[PDB]
Amino acid sequence: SGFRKMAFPSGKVEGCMVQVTCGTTTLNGLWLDDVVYCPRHVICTSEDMLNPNYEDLLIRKSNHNFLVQAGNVQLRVIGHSMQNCVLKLKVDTANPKTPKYKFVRIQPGQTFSVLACYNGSPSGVYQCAMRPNFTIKGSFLNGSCGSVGFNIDYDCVSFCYMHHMELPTGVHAGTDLEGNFYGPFVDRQTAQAAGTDTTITVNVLAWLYAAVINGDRWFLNRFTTTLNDFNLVAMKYNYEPLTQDHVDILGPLSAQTGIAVLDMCASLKELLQNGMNGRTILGSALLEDEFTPFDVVRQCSGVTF
């Protein structure tokens, strides 16, 4: 037992990371089959990034202006295109390490593993969630652009995120692998409003179920509540309203623990109204919302890839 914030094994993705250089800018790319994906602002100089005309900038560029390197291996670029906010560089070689993979656009509240890279080399891996306002709270220094987020379901890598920017507020924004930004964000250096964030209520409930499974039970009540009564308190405290879809998803954890979902909601209500009294739950002094119900089940099931 025990419960930890746990990233997927990153081997399959390590073998897809390359370095992409264009003019002066170098960032990371994702080499799958015979295509390399990377943020399109690799073609920006530090003067352009206030309001770049990407079409006009890409037009000054030809295949040989893009340097793609896989470790020491140089790749030959035989085609280039812009799809939304990503560049797709066609290379004459297929990545011999290409995993089985999908491109997916995740929903707010879902989680994924991030492999932070610089100059095409992996530096570390960590788990995070797509916030309800479509930002993520990551660790992304300059040059981490092109780092990708992913999930793995037995041998299949579902890529869901590519890092593009840090906002002036210190949070992060990026696209799906088709180049569409999560959220209202654009790839230019300006002040951009992320908007009010909220807490992923269903994830907090999964984490409280994770805690009961692992012995932390001090927060269980002699009380219950109603979906609508609880949502009243969710509103006051900026929690996502809970729905019947969420209740269903928590079914498996309700059945493993024998604690009705609404009873668990009643425990959450009291934790929101009375704080935690300097106590801890799974080693945390606040309510953690970056575990999906699927995440919790994975850890307690021991699923492998």
Q: Residue 281 corresponds to which tokens in the numbers above?
A: 């739950």
Among 100, 105, 137, 236, contact with its own copies (rule: CB under 8 A): 137
CA-wise closest residue to 182 among 136, 237, 221, 119: 136
- In the bound state with ligand G7L, the residue whose beta carbon lies nearer, of 138 and 293, is 138
Interface positions, 69-108, toward its own copies (CB under 8 A): none
Among 32, 116, 162, 165, contact with ligand G7L (rule: CB under 6 A): 165
Q: Residue 251 corresponds to which tokens in the numbers above?
A: 């079914």
Residues taking part in catalysis: 41, 145
189 touching ligand G7L, by CB under 6 A: yes
Among 136, 145, 242, 268, contact with ligand G7L (rule: CB under 6 A): 145
CA-wise closest residue to 256 among 202, 209, 208: 209
Q: How far apart are CA 191 and CA 205, in angstroms?
A: 34
- In the bound state with ligand G7L, the residue whose beta carbon lies nearer, of 142 and 301, is 142
Least distance between ligand G7L and beta carbon 254 (Å): 27
Tokens 């003067």 -> residue = 47
Phi, then psi, of 204 in degrees rounded to 5: -60, -40
166 touching its own copies, by CB under 8 A: yes
- Find all residues with CB under 8 Å of 53, minimum gap 6, and list them: none
Q: How far apart are CA 29 and CA 43, in angstroms?
A: 13
Q: Which residues bind its own copies (CB under 8 A)?
A: 1-11, 14-15, 115-119, 121-126, 128, 137-141, 143-144, 166, 170, 172, 214-215, 275, 278, 280, 283-286, 298-300, 302-305
Q: Which residues bind ligand G7L (CB under 6 A)?
A: 41, 44, 49, 142-145, 163-165, 187-189
